[PDB]
Each structure stands twice: as C-alpha cells, then as structure tokens.
Amino acid sequence: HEADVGGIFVKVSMDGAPYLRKIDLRVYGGYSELLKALETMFKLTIGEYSEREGYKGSEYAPTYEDKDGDWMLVGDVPWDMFVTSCKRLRIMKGTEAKGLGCGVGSH
C-alpha cells in the first residue's frame, strides 16, 4: 500500500537557535523513521516518548500540531491516526518545551 507517500508537508522550526527544515509525514511509514529523522535533523539524539513524561526529549522535544491545534510530543496518538491529524512540526530545546510540557513532561 504505497499510494500515500509525500503529500502532507510539515513545516518545522527551531527555538532559541535559528533553523529552517521541512519534511513530510508519510515518508517515514512509521514511528521508527519518525524518531530517527529528528536525530538526523539537528545531528543529535532525541529522547523517545517515555510513557511517564513523554515530553522530556532529553534536550529536544519533537512537537506537532494536532487537529485541535494543541502541541504535544510525538508518541501520543498511534501512527495511523497521527499522520492524518498532524498539521505542523516543531522541535525545540527542552528549556522551551518545558512550557508545553502539559502536566509534568519536560524538565
């Protein structure tokens, strides 16, 4: 089933430091490459969605915009629902992610 690859484009920005990247939701076909891509983006290692806080990200919390317009860290919804609902993409340092770390999440 490869007819939905590269269609919904996501726009990604960095906070505290200037960066301009852009990617597509479908091109990962799963969470593995999703997480791996982030590690690729800024050439470092993103912490996974630890089910306890899932917003820590170590130093970077990858966040997305859902249909409600709320920004959470990836790993909240499962891929199948996730891809069709994510609108925007923002990954940024934990010092800022701590702001949207809804209910004990980041730093």
Curated annotation (Swiss-Prot):
The N-terminal half of the protein contains two conserved domains I and II. Domain I includes a slightly degenerated ERF-associated amphiphilic repression (EAR) motif which seems to be involved in the activity of transcriptional repression. Domain II is required for the correct degradation of the protein through the SCF-mediated ubiquitin-proteasome pathway. Interactions between Aux/IAA proteins and auxin response factors (ARFs) occur through their C-terminal dimerization domains III and IV. Phosphorylated by phytochrome A in vitro. It comes from Pisum sativum. Belongs to the Aux/IAA family. The chain holds residues 86 to 189 of 189 of the full protein. Induction: By auxin. The keyword Heme does not apply. Homodimers and heterodimers. It is found in: Nucleus. Residues 7-94 form the PB1 domain. It comes from the Eukaryota. One of its GO terms (biological process) is regulation of DNA-templated transcription. This is Auxin-induced protein IAA4. The keyword Transcription applies. Its main location: nucleus. Aux/IAA proteins are short-lived transcriptional factors that function as repressors of early auxin response genes at low auxin concentrations. Repression is thought to result from the interaction with auxin response factors (ARFs), proteins that bind to the auxin-responsive promoter element (AuxRE). Formation of heterodimers with ARF proteins may alter their ability to modulate early auxin response genes expression. Keywords: Auxin signaling pathway, Nucleus, Phosphoprotein, Repressor, Transcription, Transcription regulation. GO terms for cellular component: nucleus.
